[PDB]
Amino acid sequence: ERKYSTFYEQRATLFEELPVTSKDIIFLGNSITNGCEWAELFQNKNVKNRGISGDICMGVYDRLDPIVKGKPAKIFLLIGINDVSRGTSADKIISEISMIVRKIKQESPKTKLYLQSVLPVNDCYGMFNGHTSRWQVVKQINDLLEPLAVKEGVAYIDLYSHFVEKETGKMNPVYTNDGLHLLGKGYLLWRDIVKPYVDQ
Amino acid sequence: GERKYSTFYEQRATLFEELPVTSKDIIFLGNSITNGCEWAELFQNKNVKNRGISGDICMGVYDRLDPIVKGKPAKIFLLIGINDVSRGTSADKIISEISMIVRKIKQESPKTKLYLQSVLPVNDCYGMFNGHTSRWQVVKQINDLLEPLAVKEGVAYIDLYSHFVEKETGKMNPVYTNDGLHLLGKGYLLWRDIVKPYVDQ
Ligand SMILES: [Mg+2]
Ligand SMILES: [Mg+2]
């Protein structure tokens, strides 16, 4: 909306005022990143939120500078579900994620970059139909995102296999109250999956 | 619309239920104006924690005190009411509900220092959140009563409003906002400057 536009500039202007240091562990993405208290979840003061609700691949791309100038230890990226909601193809989304990977590697070569599987979605709550109705695209993106990681020599994290239900290909509803965002237990699963990579 | 705000509240609330609160913790508690900051970064203080929920109202804050107060935090910083203003709620009923937050906090964690922060001015200039912005006058009505309440209950009143407002208009200085309601980074630096002395008492 005009709200997501305005919220973007609020969060982006704030991040411009906060220093990133070489010890930092950045979580970078859309609402699913924005929704967490990352330092609390890992109990690690070097872990920082660079999530913006409604963010898309090129929104993340356009605000790398206040993050990369700090040369953080780690970036955990989760992006693309909002690009799905706009009818963008997995291939187009992969090309944009490529720009982010290559920009990070060039501006901050020492940063460990971890590409996180797009999370599954679920239309069972009848919300975010632009997202939940393109549930098949989640798999499409990750089947390309993993080889993108191998080619660019960066880690791929499979969150998807944990959050997904075997026989639907949709978000386990115990992780979500809308089919898109995580409840507490959703972030506790994330924590258990990614924790070993926060402590590499 | 209100469904996304309702589900977002349960999302933030259930996460806070999994996040332990301790005797050293400094809590920023309130609505999207609290939610929007990275508090521990703003104050370079690992003890400072975000319990902001976009869209929250006084009774939404009241109903979620348990997982904050049971850890007996060092400080709570409260900023709440503008979403109640947006529902046509009177400054009197708002104060009434803020008074129940204050007594629950004292009762459950009496060593917790509580700080009551002036409700921030709004500005209809951007034509956004017209529920909030048309009612810019109700801001100062709440604050006229909020300072005497603090004094009554023996808790701090922090005046943010006098720094954010344009005295000529009675509205949010557009330099701190792109929508009439929420803060730009600059907005949060002005907030830090005002509150850091209370954060470090
Ligand atoms: Mg559920
Ligand atoms: Mg402005």
Author numbering:
A (entry chain BBB): 22 to 221
B (entry chain AAA): 21 to 221
Give passages from the manuscript.
A crystal from the Apo I condition diffracted to a resolution of 1.44 Å and had P1211 symmetry, while a crystal from the Apo II condition diffracted to 2.06 Å resolution and had P61 symmetry. The unit cells of these crystals contained four and eight protomers for the Apo I and Apo II forms, respectively. These protomers were arranged as dimers in both crystal forms, recapitulating the dimeric form observed in solution. The PvSAE Apo I and Apo II structures displayed a near-complete overlap when aligned [root-mean-square deviation (r.m.s.d.) of 0.18 Å], with the secondary structures in the same conformation. The only major difference between these structures was a small region of the most N-terminal α-helix, which is discussed below. Mg2+ interacts with the carbonyl groups of Pro194 and Thr197, the side-chain hydroxyl group of Tyr146 and three waters. Docking into the ‘blocked’ site of the Apo I structure resulted in a ligand conformation with the 2-position projecting towards the N-terminal α-helix, suggesting that this active site could only accommodate monomeric substrates. A similar conformation to the blocked active site was observed in the Apo II structure.
Here, the crystal structure of a 9-O-SAE from Phocaeicola vulgatus (PvSAE) is reported. Structural characterization revealed PvSAE to be a dimer with an SGNH fold, named after the conserved sequence motif of this family, and a Ser–His–Asp catalytic triad. Biochemical assays also show that PvSAE deacetylates both mucin and the acetylated chromophore para-nitrophenyl acetate. Therefore, bacteria employ esterases to make acetylated sialic acid more accessible for cleavage by sialidases.
